[PDB]
Amino acid sequence: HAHLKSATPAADSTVAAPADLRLTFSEGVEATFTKVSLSKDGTEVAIKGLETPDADKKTLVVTPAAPLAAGNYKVVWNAVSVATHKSNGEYSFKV
Ligand SMILES: [Cl-]
Ligand SMILES: [Cl-]
Ligand SMILES: [Cu+2]
Ligand code: NA
C-alpha cells in the first residue's frame, strides 16, 4: 500500500503561501482515483488539480484554485496505488 512518506508544506511546519502541495508516497499513486480534501479552519478549500508528473507516480501535486490564505490547513487523503490498493491518512500545516 502507498504510505505518505513526506509532504510540502511538511506536516505541522509553517511556510509562506505555497503554489501547491506535494505528497510523496512509498508507491505510485493514481491521480484519477486518489482523493485529497484540503480544508482551512474546517471549510473546504478548492483544489483545481491532481497530477503525478514523474513516471514512478510517487509524488502527487495537489494545486488549489487560489494561492493559500495564511492560516491552519487540514489535508485528508485517500490514495489509490498503481496496484489498485486504497490507503488513507491526514496531516496539518499552517501558512
Ligand atoms: Cl501513511
Ligand atoms: Cl476541492
Ligand atoms: Cu499493500
Ligand atoms: Na487486492
Side-chain angles (χ1 to χ4, degrees):
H1 285 62
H3 287 227
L4 190 65
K5 305 259 74 201
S6 54
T8 66
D12 303 275
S13 88
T14 301
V15 292
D20 58 35
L21 316 192
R22 287 178 154 72
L23 278 68
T24 297
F25 291 102
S26 67
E27 261 179 78
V29 294
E30 296 291 355
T32 32
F33 301 109
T34 296
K35 301 180 186 268
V36 189
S37 166
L38 181 59
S39 63
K40 196 199 106 83
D41 309 311
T43 212
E44 176 200 328
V45 185
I47 288 145
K48 78 106 62 29
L50 292 192
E51 65 164 331
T52 52
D54 326 330
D56 60 12
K57 309 173 55 119
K58 283 202 198 311
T59 307
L60 181 64
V61 189
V62 173
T63 312
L68 292 186
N72 305 268
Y73 288 89
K74 194 197 228 284
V75 185
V76 183
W77 62 263
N78 288 277
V80 170
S81 77
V82 288
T84 279
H85 286 132
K86 292 176 185 188
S87 46
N88 73 283
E90 57 183 50
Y91 66 89
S92 290
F93 73 84
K94 224 175 306 212
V95 26

